[PDB]
Design a protein around this ligand. Structure first.
Ligand SMILES: C[n+]1ccc(-c2cc[n+](C)cc2)cc1
Lengths: 89, 98, 103, 90
């Protein structure tokens, strides 16, 4: 159910500004954890967390041309499966 | 006066526990903040109302109207000895209230 | 043991309330920090027993003993104020509590 | 037999002061000390900021050099003791 609609608004060779639909007031979670790592897997992934009222987040420090996989987890799996997508800088 | 804040702390705790049953594991941000605000207020209310009235009385009174009001608004929209027993403690408050 | 890990939760709250009179409106450090800690302990143990103990049983047990426990701690830690006549009101408040949970 | 005690200026700086105070005994420790600073001449209001009661030190910034100021460390209420106030010229 939440989060819903994970897409990339702006894109730099080294950065990605992502956004999602945080739900709607009474379905606002307290936080979303965002996981971004290389689409391959030669190294582990990176991960941070964003407050639940926020629907957007920035991802800095990426390598140009490399494809990445971004996942936005809810606080728990009860709010639905985590939405994940793919993008190339 | 002192039994106004005690009952105000009763309403606060009741609203907190109900906003807790609405929210999940403190994840639903809006009612999660409600529970924190309701609690932080109610604890600051009990801290101030315990200096006035005897504490074992503010204790007893709270456990009374607590389940009394929690089951009062239970039949409100959500989910016999409970109606008369309500008036029983309610009269018990009437012989420890001003 | 569920009923005994409840007893830790009820006594932690019983201890914490008498410290809240020392908290001085949450303006005195050590009693102010003391009552939030004692209540955190009560939280930890009640939820530990709610997976085994039914609701109103644990609550009315808390009620009667809690009215009893701190009122004797108040008759010793501090003393007595009393602004009305009947002590038995709290026992029949507890009784009114006992007959809307158990009954 | 009051708190806080011994309000002193540890370090100084044209635009910042570092102060401390004797918090007293453990039963004399409070939850939040509020601290007020302003000009000695008194042609302005009084800036105010709080600090948790488990810290006996506080740092102030944004001062104008050369001016004489008056610092006063308060308490949550007026029951713990009279507030200690001192002076210092940056
Ligand atoms: C953490 N905490 C919650 C509620 C109370 C409380 C005390 C006495 N009564 C009767 C009800 C609620 C005390 C502490």
């Amino acid at each position: 159910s939440v989060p819903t609609k994970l897409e990339v608004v702006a894109a730099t060779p080294t950065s990605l500004l992502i956004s999602w639909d945080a739900g709607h007031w009474w379905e606002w979670v307290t936080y979303y954890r965002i996981t971004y790592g290389e689409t391959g897997g030669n190294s582990p992934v990176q991960e941070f967390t964003v407050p639940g009222y926020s629907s957007t987040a920035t991802i800095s420090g990426l390598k140009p041309g490399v494809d990445y996989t971004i996942t936005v987890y809810a606080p728990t799996s009860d709010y639905g499966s985590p939405i994940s997508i793919n993008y190339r800088t | 006066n002192p039994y106004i804040y005690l009952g105000g702390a009763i309403l606060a705790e009741v609203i907190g526990t109900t906003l807790m049953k609405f929210s999940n594991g403190f994840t639903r941000l809006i009612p999660s903040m409600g529970t924190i605000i309701c609690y932080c207020a109610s604890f600051w209310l009990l801290a101030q109302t315990l200096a006035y009235i005897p504490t074992g009385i503010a204790y007893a009174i709270w456990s009374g109207v607590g389940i009394v009001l929690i089951s009062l608004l239970s039949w409100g929209f959500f989910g016999l000895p409970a109606i008369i027993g309500m008036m029983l403690i309610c009269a018990g408050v009437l012989i420890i209230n001003l």
